[PDB]
Structure 1
Amino acid sequence: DKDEAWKCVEQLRREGTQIAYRSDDWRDLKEAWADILIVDATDKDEAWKQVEQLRREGATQIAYRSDDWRDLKEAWKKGADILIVDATDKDEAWKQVEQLRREGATQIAYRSDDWRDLKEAWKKGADILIVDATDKDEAWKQVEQLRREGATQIAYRSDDWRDLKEAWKKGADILICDAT
């Protein structure tokens, strides 16, 4: 389970940029404090409690993920620096980015499996573009496209360290170890 996730951080550290761990427990995120800690959306009462708990602990790059910008704005208020708009509906996603940008959100991230949706999010204000690899093999191609477009903070989400390493080589600067 989380032990597979852990073996890969091991390999990514060994291989040398920024590592992020997605996690539901806040201790695990701490034990892992991994440079970017992604508090996972599950009982917003507990999530906001982990952002808060991490902020007090001095954790420096706190991220929160949601499909709802209102939840992201709340997380931001409570100490999250990085606000991950989770796109599965394409157009309603770009709205979350747009709304957050209006609210003055500093580090908006956008999760998608399609580099063109990522490119568009980028234009609308997403500074962190997360390429979601679950058809793992191919997904570096998206990193490459975004690199070419001039995106400067490309993230790659994968449960496999070899794939993370390849993404990194194709220009991903944030490697998200996501083994649920």
Structure 2
Amino acid sequence: DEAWKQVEILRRLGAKRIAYRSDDWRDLQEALKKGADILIVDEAWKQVEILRRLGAKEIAYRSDDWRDLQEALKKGADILIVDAAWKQVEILRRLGAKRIAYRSDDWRDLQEALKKGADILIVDATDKDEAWKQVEILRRLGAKEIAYRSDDWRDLQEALKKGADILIVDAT
């Protein structure tokens, strides 16, 4: 409901890179004011446009349609989220994407996406302990910008302790 409160807690607990995912631009705008650094917009380009006009400098957009991804970029979206092959990261950069986030449940897949120029590696595995291990594996390999998502700030805090650089607060 009011998830921006989770951003405050993680801020005070030493989270330097916090993202906020929501389908309400006002909910997203309020999160930016509470310390959120990345606004993930889940017809949704009207949101990235508003947040862009409201001074947001790190808007992410996810979608399976590339005409949709392309429209989001034109409206201001700085980050584009690919959900798992890694062979489309370079293809996506040609569309004009300044930053590419790659979501996958396997660390090998994420490392492959990192070699192709992916800037952000989102760990999204079924189990929580299995997700922890993938963060740990990527951290050991030196992967920069490891991201983990959860609607429980305690899991996010644990993620940060395991090696996650970006904590995605999932608002709902």
- Alignment partner, residue 139 of structure 1: 131
For each residue in 1:90-127, what CA deviation from the matched residue of structure 2 results, as whole angstroms up to 9, or x when unmatched? Answer: xxx32432311233422100111111111111112211
Aligned partner of 1:154 in structure 2 is 146
In the TM superposition, residue 70 of structure 1 has moved relative to its aligned partner by 3.7
TM-score by length of 1: 0.85
> Which whole-Å CA distance do the structure 1 matches of 2:134 and 2:155 have between them?
13
1:25 aligns with 2:6: no
The answer to whether structure 1 residue 36 and structure 2 residue 28 are counterparts is: no
Q: Equivalent residues in 2 for 1:71-82 (5 A)? A: 71-82=68-79
Q: Is the 8 A contact 1:133 1:158 kept in 2?
A: no
Q: Match for 1:174 among 160, 166, 170? A: 166
Contact 2:73 2:96 in 1 (8 A): no
SS of 2:77's equivalent?
coil
Identity %: 83
- Is 1:11 the counterpart of 2:26? The answer is no
Q: Are the aligned partners of 2:104 and 2:125 in contact in 1 as well (CA < 8 Å)? A: no
Query: Do the aligned residues in 2 keep the contact of 1:68 with 1:96 (CA within 8 Å)?
Result: no
Amino acid at match of 2:164: A
DSSP-derived class of the 1:60 partner: coil
The CA distance in 2 between the partners of 1:77 and 1:48, in whole Å, is: 9
Name the aligned partner's letter for residue 147 of structure 1.
R
Q: Structure 1 runs of 4+ off > 3 angstroms?
A: none
| 1:115 aligned residue (94, 107, 111) | 107
Unmatched 5+ residue regions in structure 1?
Answer: 88-92
Structure 1 CA distance for aligned equivalents of residues 97 and 91 of structure 2: 9
How many Å apart are 1:29 and its aligned residue? 0.3
Question: Which amino acid counterpart does residue 11 of structure 1 have in structure 2?
Answer: I
Q: Distance in 1 between matches of 2:90 and 2:65?
A: 12
Q: What is the deviation of 1:76?
A: 1.5
How far, CA to CA, are the matches of 1:85 and 1:160 in structure 2? 23
Partner of 2:57: 60
Q: How many residues align?
A: 168
Compute the RMSD of aligned alpha carbons.
Answer: 1.8
CA distance in 1 between counterparts of 2:119 and 2:129 reads 25
Gaps of 5+ in 2: none
Distance 1:84 1:21 in 2: 14
TM-score, normalisation: structure 2? 0.88
Instruction: Assess, with a 3 A threshold, how the Cα gap between structure 1 residues 50 and 15 changes in structure 2: closer, same or farther.
Output: same
Moved more, 98-107 or 138-147: 98-107
Moved more, 56-65 or 74-83: 74-83
2: CA distance, partners of 1:113 / 1:10: 28
Aligned partner letter, 1:124: K
Residue 85 of structure 1 deviates from its aligned partner by: 0.8
